[PDB]
Structure 1
Amino acid sequence: QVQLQESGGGLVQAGGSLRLSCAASESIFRMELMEWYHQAPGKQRELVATINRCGSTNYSDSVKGRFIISSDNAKNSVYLQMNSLKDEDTAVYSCHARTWTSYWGRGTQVTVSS
Structure 2
Amino acid sequence: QVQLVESGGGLVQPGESLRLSCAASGSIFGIYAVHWFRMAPGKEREFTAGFGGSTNYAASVKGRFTMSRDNAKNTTYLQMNSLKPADTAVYYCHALIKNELGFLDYWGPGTQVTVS
What interval of TM-score do these two structures reach, taking the shorter chain for normalisation?
0.7 to 0.9
Kindly indicate whether residue 6 of structure 2 is the aligned counterpart of residue 6 of structure 1.
yes
1:75 maps to what in 2? 73
TM-score in terms of structure 1 length: 0.83
Contact 2:2 2:28 in 1 (8 A): no
User: How has the CA–CA distance of structure 1 residues 4 and 50 changed in structure 2, closer, same or farther, with 3 Å as cutoff?
Assistant: same
TM-score in terms of structure 2 length: 0.82
Q: How does 1:75-114 map to 2 (within 5 A)?
A: 75-99=73-97, 100-113=103-116
Contact 2:17 2:83 in 1 (8 A): yes
2:32 maps to what in 1? 32
User: How has the CA–CA distance of structure 1 residues 62 and 44 changed in structure 2, closer, same or farther, with 3 Å as cutoff?
Assistant: farther
Question: How many residues end up aligned between the 2 structures?
Answer: 110
Read off the aligned partner of 1:96 and give its amino acid letter.
H
Unpaired runs of at least 5, structure 1: none
Q: Identity percentage over the alignment? A: 66
User: How has the CA–CA distance of structure 1 residues 62 and 109 changed in structure 2, closer, same or farther, with 3 Å as cutoff?
Assistant: farther
Structure-1 separation of matches of 2:6 and 2:115: 18
Contact 2:57 2:65 in 1 (8 A): no
Structure-2 separation of matches of 1:81 and 1:32: 19
Whose strand proportion is higher, 1 or 2? 1
